[PDB]
Amino acid sequence: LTEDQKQEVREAFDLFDSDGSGTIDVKELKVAMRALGFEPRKEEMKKMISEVDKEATGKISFNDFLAVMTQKMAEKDTKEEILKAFRLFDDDETGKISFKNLKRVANELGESLTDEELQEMIDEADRDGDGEVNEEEFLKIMKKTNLYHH
Ligand SMILES: [Ca+2]
Ligand SMILES: [Ca+2]
Ligand SMILES: [Ca+2]
Ligand SMILES: [Ca+2]
């Protein structure tokens, strides 16, 4: 759930609803997201259209619009918190988390993890195989990990 921001979501809906019909188009959806500071991803969009409207109407209600905007503003906060955590591990700021980086912070927070258990963490996140974890890869394991923690 969003808080005071749904008043801003309402303002963006009414403005790009030319008719005042209480419904917007697929073409009107993407500009209203752009107005609220969100660049709609093309791959992300096709799943969104199907999720808010199954029938061949092409209409999007305010409640549909509040639903997509809530997850987008939630994703933005989730991403920013993940990247805040990413900078904690990559303290030498090379752009990648090494085994030495992960071990150092594990000892600093007093985590009861051995060298083998820490290295397994690197290898599962390491999708490309260079032995270190970059920004793209760290975002992948973190959304997986969010499933376990709430
Ligand atoms: Ca309309
Ligand atoms: Ca609908
Ligand atoms: Ca590093
Ligand atoms: Ca890597």
Measured CA distances, 62 to 11, 13, 35 (Å): 11, 7, 15
Ligand lying nearest the CA atom of residue 68: 2
Bridge partners of 97, per DSSP, are 133
How far does Cα 126 stand from its chain's mean position?
A: 20
Alpha-carbon dihedral sign for residues 141, 120, 88, 127: negative
Question: Is 17 marked as a binding-site residue?
Answer: yes
For residue 36, how far is its CA from the centre of ligand 4 (angstroms)? 33
Question: Is 8 marked as a binding-site residue?
Answer: no
Question: Is 91 marked as a binding-site residue?
Answer: no
Q: What are phi and psi of 61, to 5 degrees?
A: -75, 170
Residue 98, number of CB atoms within 10 A of its CB: 17
- The ranges assigned to domains in the chain are 1-75, 76-150
Tell the residue number behind the tokens 């500009």, with chain if given. 31
The resolution in Å comes to 2.8
